[PDB]
């Protein structure tokens, strides 16, 4: 079957792959859709180590073709997902405390195990969360990483209704972060990006304020217009956004780091201490987070911006991603 | 009366002052003693703006000599304190939510209002927390800032009993943080400093592990020996400790920033995100935090290491502090 495979020179080989038979607890999905995440870009670029040979993809939606021995959580015909959180150990300090994505034995689709950017994908059944009936597959692909991650990030931000949240980076994740923050958590939102087209879309979807941080001083403007944001979620792919977020929140405010540029942020210590700032990393979401995130999309509370592409376009898509030419998500369509 | 006043060239002049009359809600303290905090050093060096002319000190313990109009919270004869949190507004998003030290109209003793390093001090009665009867004045002075700050920091760290907490900087604050962490919160403690003599004190007081971060790679050792600390409290006066703390915690761990070096810390973004790290600033403690911190010292659960000095020694003390020669706290003794 055809798969997106990472190459040694950091490109994608759209090539032939043959899957092994199933083990106990596994299921085989015939894939319908797989979103392209910027994490796929980091992976293929070698940012998290050399993963030449891995099949990419962890916004995968597929239909169960076969189940392996012992499988009761899925049956043939079910629509299920292939997310970054592909499998946790189920029995550790993280897994049993409601923090399973931090499992130190975690397997991650499109990184440490073959992902869903291929015609077929093997999943661990109890970890392939089902898609609810009212949600179309292309939209569901976006929720499978972009959506769940930002739903969870906003949850973790401690933002309360009527409060100001600054969203940095309005791409695949960021646009959905805006929608969750506004439509689900009832926050007021500042949308911040270096790309005017991303900002145009944000305003179109209800961002209360929009700032181009390349031409403007984003933190200063947030402070002037809102009194300082109560929280921030940083989904941008550059350290400057993280640095700006620290200065954009009011005292006691929480910055949630989500973006993964291979860089360091700088945090002024007297600012951190004397203003009681908080900075916290967030990592995708638990299976329950994903279930909840899907249901919001099923009920139309968030609407993923998606465009369908054939698998052959994957290298071109990554160029578009690099160049900031994507509104929302590009979604690989395997449907014949 | 005599007062420690900040000079234009970042020293202290012992100066005669005559205090103004009390206003409504105020009280006059005849001071018994005043601890020297490293914050006094930052203040006099101009790290927080020029405060030439200000009376230093916010580890003050005094006896109420006189009360102004309307005062019922204090009466003549009471022993009360002069802390960093000298007065909050009492009616704002911070003051009413249990976060009063973050009040944006806060007055800080020894910085934005005359402090307690003088023979007399005017306090706002409702904000001058009383000292419990079972606690000697010199010991109480340390709890007034070093103690309440580290009590609150450990509380905020969310360390649970049996868990590992790394304490960076074992000075005036750090030695008390160790005592609170071990004796009150029942944590296992790693003590970390660049000074072997501070570490010896930590070990004497039951630190489970001690590490010299100058001669050893502290984070590596913490990871190796404990699997990574569940939390950290950083009271050190150098950015390297804040940077190391981020690497010394396990995934999901919380670093509580307390020290105030005029520097920035650096946070590797993928580490922050992929390991769900949390970094939060802590700022002294509420009046209730101080009351609780005082009570622990009164019952002997913590025992401040103190040495008494005359007011005339203040510049010398700051030199000892700068040079890393102080152990525990130096306390200005005004007593007869």
């Amino acid at each position: 079957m055809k798969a997106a495979v990472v190459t040694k020179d950091h490109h994608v080989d759209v090539t032939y792959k043959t899957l092994r038979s199933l083990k106990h607890g596994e299921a085989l999905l015939k894939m319908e859709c797989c979103g392209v995440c910027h994490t796929d870009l980091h992976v293929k670029n070698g940012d998290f180590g050399d993963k030449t040979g891995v099949i990419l993809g962890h916004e995968g939606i597929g239909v169960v073709a076969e189940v392996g021995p012992g499988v009761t959580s899925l049956k043939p015909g079910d629509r299920a997902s292939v997310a970054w959180f592909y499998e946790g150990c189920g029995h550790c300090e993280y897994c049993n405390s409601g923090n399973e994505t931090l499992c130190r034995s975690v397997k991650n689709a499109g990184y440490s195990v073959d992902g869903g950017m291929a015609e077929e994908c093997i999943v661990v059944a109890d970890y392939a969360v089902k898609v609810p009936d009212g949600l179309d597959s292309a939209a569901a692909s976006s929720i499978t990483c972009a959506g769940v991650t930002t739903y969870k990030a906003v949850k973790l931000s401690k933002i309360r209704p009527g409060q100001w949240i600054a969203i940095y980076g309005l791409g695949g994740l960021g646009n959905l972060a805006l929608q969750y923050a506004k439509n689900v958590f009832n926050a007021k939102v500042i949308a911040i990006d270096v790309n005017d087209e991303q900002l145009k879309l944000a305003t179109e979807m209800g961002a209360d304020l929009a700032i181009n941080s390349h031409t403007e001083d984003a933190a200063k403007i947030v402070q002037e217009k809102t009194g300082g944001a109560h929280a921030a979620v940083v989904t941008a792919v550059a350290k400057a956004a993280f640095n700006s977020a620290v200065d954009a929140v009011r005292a006691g405010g929480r910055v949630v780091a989500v973006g993964l540029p291979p860089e360091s942020m700088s945090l002024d210590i007297p600012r951190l201490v004397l203003d009681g700032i908080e900075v916290v990393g967030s990592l995708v979401g638990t299976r329950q987070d994903l279930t909840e995130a899907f249901q919001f999309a099923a009920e139309g509370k968030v609407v993923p911006k998606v465009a369908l592409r054939p698998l052959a376009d994957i290298n071109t898509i990554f160029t578009e991603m690099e160049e900031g030419k994507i509104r929302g998500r590009m979604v690989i369509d395997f449907r014949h | 009366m005599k007062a420690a006043v900040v000079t234009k060239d970042h020293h202290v002049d012992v100066t005669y002052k005559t205090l103004r009359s009390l206003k409504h809600g105020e009280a006059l303290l005849k001071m018994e003693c005043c601890g020297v905090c490293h914050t006094d050093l930052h203040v006099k060096n101009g790290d927080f703006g020029d405060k030439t002319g200000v009376i230093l000190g916010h580890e003050g313990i005094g006896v109420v000599a006189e009360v102004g109009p309307g005062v019922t919270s204090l009466k003549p004869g009471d022993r009360a304190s002069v802390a960093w949190f000298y007065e909050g507004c009492g009616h704002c998003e911070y003051c009413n939510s249990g976060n009063e030290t973050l009040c944006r109209s806060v007055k800080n003793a020894g910085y934005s209002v005359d402090g307690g390093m003088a023979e007399e001090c005017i306090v706002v009665a409702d904000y001058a927390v009383k000292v419990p009867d079972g606690l000697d004045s010199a010991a109480a002075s340390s709890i007034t800032c070093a103690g309440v700050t580290t009590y609150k920091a450990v509380k905020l760290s969310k360390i649970r009993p049996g868990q590992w907490i790394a304490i960076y900087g074992l000075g005036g604050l750090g030695n008390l943080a160790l005592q609170y962490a071990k004796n009150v919160f029942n944590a296992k403690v790693i003590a970390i400093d660049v000074n072997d003599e501070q570490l010896k004190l930590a070990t004497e007081m039951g630190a489970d592990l001690a590490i010299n971060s100058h001669t050893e790679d502290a984070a590596k050792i913490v990871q190796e020996k404990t699997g990574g600390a569940h939390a950290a409290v950083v009271t050190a006066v150098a950015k390297a400790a804040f940077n190391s703390a981020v690497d010394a915690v396990r995934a999901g761990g919380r670093v509580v920033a307390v020290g105030l070096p005029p520097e920035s810390m650096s946070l590797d973004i993928p580490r922050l995100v992929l390991d769900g790290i949390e970094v939060v600033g802590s700022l002294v403690g509420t009046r209730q935090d101080l009351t609780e911190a005082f009570q622990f010292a009164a019952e002997g659960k913590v025992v401040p290491k103190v040495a008494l000095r005359p007011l005339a020694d203040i510049n010398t003390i700051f030199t000892e502090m700068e040079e890393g020669k102080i152990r525990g706290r130096m306390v200005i003794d005004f007593r007869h």
């Binding site: 300082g228 002024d268 | 934005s112």
Partner: peptide, 10 residues
């Protein structure tokens, strides 16, 4: 002021 640790306070 904003930010401006401590100095920015009212």
């Amino acid at each position: 002021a904003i930010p401006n640790p401590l100095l920015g306070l009212a």
